[PDB]
Amino acid sequence: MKRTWQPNRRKRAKTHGFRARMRTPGGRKVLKRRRQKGRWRLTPAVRKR
Protein backbone atom coordinates (compact mmCIF):
# COMPACT_ATOMS: atom_id res chain seq x y z
CA MET A 1 0.00 0.00 0.00
CA LYS A 2 1.09 3.59 -0.56
CA ARG A 3 3.94 4.18 1.88
CA THR A 4 5.23 7.51 3.23
CA TRP A 5 8.30 8.02 1.01
CA GLN A 6 7.38 9.28 -2.45
CA PRO A 7 10.67 10.70 -3.78
CA ASN A 8 10.48 13.91 -5.78
CA ARG A 9 13.71 15.69 -6.56
CA ARG A 10 12.18 19.18 -6.63
CA LYS A 11 10.26 18.68 -3.40
CA ARG A 12 13.48 17.67 -1.68
CA ALA A 13 15.54 20.70 -2.75
CA LYS A 14 12.61 23.05 -2.36
CA THR A 15 12.22 21.74 1.19
CA HIS A 16 15.61 20.84 2.75
CA GLY A 17 17.72 22.47 0.04
CA PHE A 18 20.63 24.75 0.92
CA ARG A 19 18.90 27.94 -0.17
CA ALA A 20 15.72 27.01 1.73
CA ARG A 21 17.87 26.56 4.81
CA MET A 22 19.39 30.02 4.42
CA ARG A 23 16.14 32.01 4.16
CA THR A 24 14.92 31.21 7.65
CA PRO A 25 16.99 32.12 10.74
CA GLY A 26 15.95 28.76 12.16
CA GLY A 27 17.41 27.09 9.09
CA ARG A 28 20.68 29.00 9.27
CA LYS A 29 21.24 27.42 12.67
CA VAL A 30 20.69 23.96 11.27
CA LEU A 31 23.63 24.71 8.98
CA LYS A 32 25.48 26.24 11.93
CA ARG A 33 24.87 23.12 13.96
CA ARG A 34 25.66 20.74 11.14
CA ARG A 35 28.89 22.54 10.29
CA GLN A 36 29.99 22.65 13.92
CA LYS A 37 29.40 18.90 14.18
CA GLY A 38 31.55 18.25 11.13
CA ARG A 39 28.75 16.71 9.11
CA TRP A 40 30.01 15.87 5.65
CA ARG A 41 26.71 16.96 4.11
CA LEU A 42 24.99 20.10 5.43
CA THR A 43 22.00 19.35 3.21
CA PRO A 44 20.27 16.30 1.73
CA ALA A 45 22.15 15.32 -1.41
CA VAL A 46 19.94 15.64 -4.48
CA ARG A 47 20.50 15.59 -8.25
CA LYS A 48 18.82 15.66 -11.70
CA ARG A 49 19.55 17.75 -14.81
Q: Which of 6, 7, 10, 31 binds Mg ion (CB under 5 A)?
A: 10
- CA 8 from chain centre, in angstroms, equals 13
What distance in Å separates the CA atoms of residue 48 and residue 32, rounded to the nearest whole number?
27
Of the ranges 8-16, 21-29, 31-39, which one interacts with Mg ion (CB under 5 A)? 8-16
Assess 32 for contact with Mg ion (CB under 5 A). Answer: no
Residues near RNA (CB under 7 A): 1-12, 15-16, 20-21, 23-27, 29-30, 37-41, 44, 47-49
Give, as one character, the DSSP assignment of residue 8.
-
Q: What separation, in Å, do the N-terminal and C-terminal C-alpha atoms of the chain show? A: 30
Instruction: Please choose which of RNA, Mg ion, none residue 35 contacts, taking the beta carbon within 5 to 8 angstroms, the exact cut-off set by kind.
Output: none
